[PDB]
Write a protein that binds this ligand. Structure first.
Ligand SMILES: CSC[C@H](NC(=O)Cc1ccccc1)C(=O)N[C@@H](Cc1ccccc1)[C@H](O)C(=O)N1CSC(C)(C)[C@H]1C(=O)N[C@H]1c2ccccc2C[C@H]1O
Ligand SMILES: CSC[C@H](NC(=O)Cc1ccccc1)C(=O)N[C@@H](Cc1ccccc1)[C@H](O)C(=O)N1CSC(C)(C)[C@H]1C(=O)N[C@H]1c2ccccc2C[C@H]1O
Ligand SMILES: CSC[C@H](NC(=O)Cc1ccccc1)C(=O)N[C@@H](Cc1ccccc1)[C@H](O)C(=O)N1CSC(C)(C)[C@H]1C(=O)N[C@H]1c2ccccc2C[C@H]1O
Ligand code: NA
Lengths: 327, 323, 327, 327
């Protein structure tokens, strides 16, 4: 034997948390996904190696389980996922309602990321029309059964990792934010998406389609938008050392802004940069990625959510934004 | 109030662990750093807003404190840290020896990233020639003081998470790896750096300087090497984003005279979504550090258990194993 | 005699510092004034009581004094100032040039404030076309005379009073701020004044004339603008205990924004509020005053300069703004 | 670098000075607070960001410290302060006594104002009945322990500035005032509070509760009284350009009167008006704030203490007023 000291991971919070299935309280780790509208879970029957060291849902150990069995198969350019539909108790903290979910039974093609993390499944929190089987979103379902009064939830991510991070259902906790809470109207009942004029230095795109996505740890922007910025950065002498790398202290890096008619949401340069080293880092990389998802569409991930406490209001069809606060 | 639920971090082990100072065991979160040669720690005396949230070293609370007070200051085109040398018991695990560290007294230029991490300081595991003050590396000092027989350590990151990570001092645990341990000679005692021929598709860089650096979570390549790969791609611009589980991409090869070390697309690709991600990005970053220099961080150390041998001036590599 | 403890000031750095007249270094406490265009200094000849406690300029002591004697008289419902123009060495720090200033000869009114305070006079840092006598600005004259090579200055107020403020001449000092430093063009060369769209919750004013004024400790808004705000605050039920008093933590107060084509400058509620009590104050007041100065005109005083480091550039006719930082 | 001149604060003296705790003389800037009844100090053990730049009490450095550890928590609509009671030597000037004080371990809800000021804590000078934990006032304690013979203090603020302010303990220094010293009896031994008839123009409130509060720089008036005054000065054609703003030379403004059975205390426009600009200001605001604290309650802060040297006499349960002189 020799001297071994335990290594740790870094304090880094996202919309990762525990929910429960069945009346025997079967525990899982969920990614609470604002841009998906089903709950998906590793089934006890899953024949896929992926599934081995996960948490499982066993419909025979829960006395409140209901047969549905409607098969479903989803496939990406990247991977494939097939399962069956089940109903049972679904619980987050104190609240519980019977809900229609997908038991995963074959998972091909998401490696080594899927088996590498301690996440079991997705607990979608998007809108009805984006979901398979056309199901009412979980939180609406809580309101239907009068378990809560207002179809609303909120994500607080701790803006400096000094404390726990939280998902709150049924009401707005003022402990989480400073300044005003501001609602924007949804441009569609598909995702949590809003019309905003986006500005990044001299580049701008009016009335862009902008989407909240608690699953990405990136900011996203169209290719052409990203090209215009690269060229404009060049015009404005913003120094870069390669496409994505810059001095963290770079004084020419512009504020990224999303403007509505009555409120501007912003990420300062150091709020969209990732350090190259994990301590005392002189260099930085833009955490902004050109991807073309839809005409004029931009995605807000964790970097936005790290700064903005966000609110999701089914009843009003709005998204609330406020400056996240250290607990 | 209303129904809460706790949200937590995604388990992601790196070379970050605890170490103690003084005979009253002042505890710190350190980045165990293969590319720094001093131990740096926040002083109780630090006047910076950076130092506020952190653990501090307070010499007055330690009977084994030996006064030094030799001033240090590092300044950088943008960055400043400064402090004083002090001598006290430094403890990792069950191992303990008097050692000269730097109590940082001013920390400027590394916000907000510093205060948002729970790292307090750096525990250098590099070589003497880059130590400010020419101080023997901590592990060498353990050996001089007969705390250990061999001035060797190793770093194990769990290759598939689901498992805990380790820094081991003084010998080699077979439990951590599979297949043989291959050793490479250092090209120069400056850092843990080896001569290797690097290849990526049609592009190659002979007799490159490659540095192990436990403090980046990235793989680094010179700008010219990356431009060459872009040019060679021209035969058929992003190329930065691709499909996850795209196997039609080159493998990164680092060739020594008797072993080739590799990182396949699934070692160098990072997903854009944090579950079931359709798209992925290259975790290969072009940046010029020094002539012909490449750096190997985390994504390499996740595949390769690495051994750092001071007695023999070598680095050992082997395939990291579960448990 | 009894036990006495001294009482002091609350740390509150404004654009107030020292400068010198004549080759014998006569010193004065000046308000460095971005919205005025002459230097005004009390004369040794001043006959008023207000002048008794002040520093005085005595031309008979300076071998570099050049006689002008053109009389000036400014007379406004709060007081009247008369004086004569004189020319002499005028010195800020290391820098020095012959300049024309007004020695005040009579100061009627402005009481008790002028004599209660320890400012001697005003050091105008505005544009020529606002100057009495149409005198080139001091900073211009420095460049005209080859003392500096860029006719630019900056004002830094400590954003939390943890260090000294600084007036810098001749170039940009990055220690004061976190990038980006964004430049806006002047709408006119009368004052430091820019076209910006102002938003305060749902109220807005397009293409407003906004003016930097280092001499007020207040934010200014036209009367109508303020009335629109009151209107929508009443409708939306933002809690006010009276016309300016609110809880410091009021979550319904909006952010004040000033939008250029490429950048938004903002004041969060607690950056435009002042506390009722000087410690642990539950209650606050709006430091926003409705005043009709000019069509559609808004003035930025101390609350703004306290958050934004500001650069005043005569060569390029622009003002720069950046997030001020602690030293 | 570049030519730089320092910027300073103005001289504005308030009820704010130094006192020491413990035998090693740990110094703090305290607000000498006539409407608080404990002493509050940040603890070295405080875990809030609020405490970070402040002076701290470290009990283990003082050989005279005695453990108490009684918890205290004060919370409200938007403020939490908690801590523990500790006993040590407490020193103002050459005077020293063992005294129970509160070590703050958490200060939340008072940013950014708390960190922007160089006040560390509050040194209560009120009455026992308002003390948390039922503690004898510091100055009474000085009397009990035979360190002074009269339990009395005074606050002198220099009426025209340049001049230090002074807190005096143990007797009356005639040097601070002109004219008689008039005394008013307390309507209650809770605060330094007095029955007075308050008149402002045509508006009056008889047998008002008027409270001395050395912690506001404002004068306070119930909302109905204020409303009646503004409607009233409308009827009588006062020049107002908005709701608090008038010219600094406004001749027509009434004197504010506080009438007791044998003395009338007054505040003229001179004493209740704050200028919009910090030098040669044409425009002014009423420093009088409408705010309902309790039935018929009016607060006198700085503007009043600036004119009147005030004396606080525990022995005879009275407050004394005299016109303050220049030193
Ligand atoms: C290759 S990322 C290495 C990083 N260097 C940079 O960012 C250099 C840089 C800066 C700007 C433009 C281009 C290049 C760096 O110097 N990091 C340092 C982090 C640090 C840790 C503790 C106290 C202060 C800083 C370094 O790991 C260290 O301990 N040191 C201690 S001394 C130092 C400040 C010169 C640096 C060093 O040896 N740097 C060298 C190094 C290290 C790892 C890999 C390559 C190189 C070359 C040179 O950059
Ligand atoms: C932000 S409020 C500006 C203030 N005027 C007022 O409040 C409006 C007013 C005017 C006349 C009677 C009553 C009310 C004012 O003019 N203050 C002045 C302070 C002063 C400094 C030195 C000697 C005497 C006064 C001014 O900043 C200046 O130097 N001047 C020099 S001469 C002046 C008295 C006409 C004035 C001016 O150019 N004012 C301009 C100004 C300033 C700030 C904001 C808008 C404007 C427009 C313009 O009127
Ligand atoms: C000029 S307003 C006085 C102020 N009250 C307010 O703002 C009223 C308020 C409260 C909550 C929501 C909305 C409005 C206040 O209580 N300030 C306090 C400042 C303080 C100082 C140290 C530690 C914490 C706060 C006070 O002077 C004190 O020490 N205390 C100590 S305990 C207390 C919270 C009961 C309060 C008190 O005695 N208040 C009394 C007071 C003080 C001044 C004027 C009137 C009154 C009545 C009574 O409420
Ligand atoms: Na806009």
């Amino acid at each position: 034997e020799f001297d071994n000291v335990e290594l740790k991971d870094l304090a880094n919070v996202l919309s990762f948390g525990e929910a429960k299935l069945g009346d025997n309280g079967q525990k899982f780790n969920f990614l609470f996904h604002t841009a998906s509208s089903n709950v998906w879970v590793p089934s006890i029957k899953c024949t896929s190696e992926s599934c081995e060291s996960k948490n499982h849902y066993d419909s025979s150990k829960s006395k409140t389980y209901e047969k549905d069995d409607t098969p479903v198969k989803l496939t990406s350019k990247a991977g494939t996922i097939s399962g069956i539909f089940s109903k049972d108790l679904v619980t987050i903290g104190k609240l519980s309602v019977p809900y229609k979910f997908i038991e995963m039974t074959e998972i091909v093609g998401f490696e080594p990321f899927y088996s590498e993390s301690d996440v079991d499944g997705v607990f979608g929190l998007g809108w009805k029309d984006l979901s398979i089987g056309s199901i009412d979103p979980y939180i609406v379902e809580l309101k239907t059964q009068n378990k809560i009064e207002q179809a609303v939830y909120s994500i607080y991510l701790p803006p400096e990792n000094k404390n726990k991070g939280y998902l709150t259902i049924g009401g707005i906790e003022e402990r989480f934010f400073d300044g005003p809470l501001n609602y924007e109207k949804l441009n569609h009942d598909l995702m949590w998406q809003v019309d905003l004029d986006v500005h990044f230095g001299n580049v701008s795109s009016k009335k862009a389609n902008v989407i909240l996505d608690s699953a990405t740890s990136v900011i996203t922007v169209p290719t052409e938008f990203f090209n215009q910025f690269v060229e404009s950065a060049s015009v404005f002498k913003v120094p870069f050392l390669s496409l994505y790398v810059t001095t963290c202290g770079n004084t020419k890096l512009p504020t990224l802004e999303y403007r509505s008619p009555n409120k501007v949401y912003t990420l300062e340069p150091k709020q969209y940069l990732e350090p190259l080293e994990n301590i005392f880092s002189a260099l930085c990389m833009l955490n902004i990625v050109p991807i073309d998802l839809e005409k004029n569409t931009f995605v807000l991930g964790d970097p936005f959510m790290r700064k903005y406490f966000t609110v999701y209001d089914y009843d009003n069809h709005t998204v609330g934004f406020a400056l996240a606060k250290n607990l």
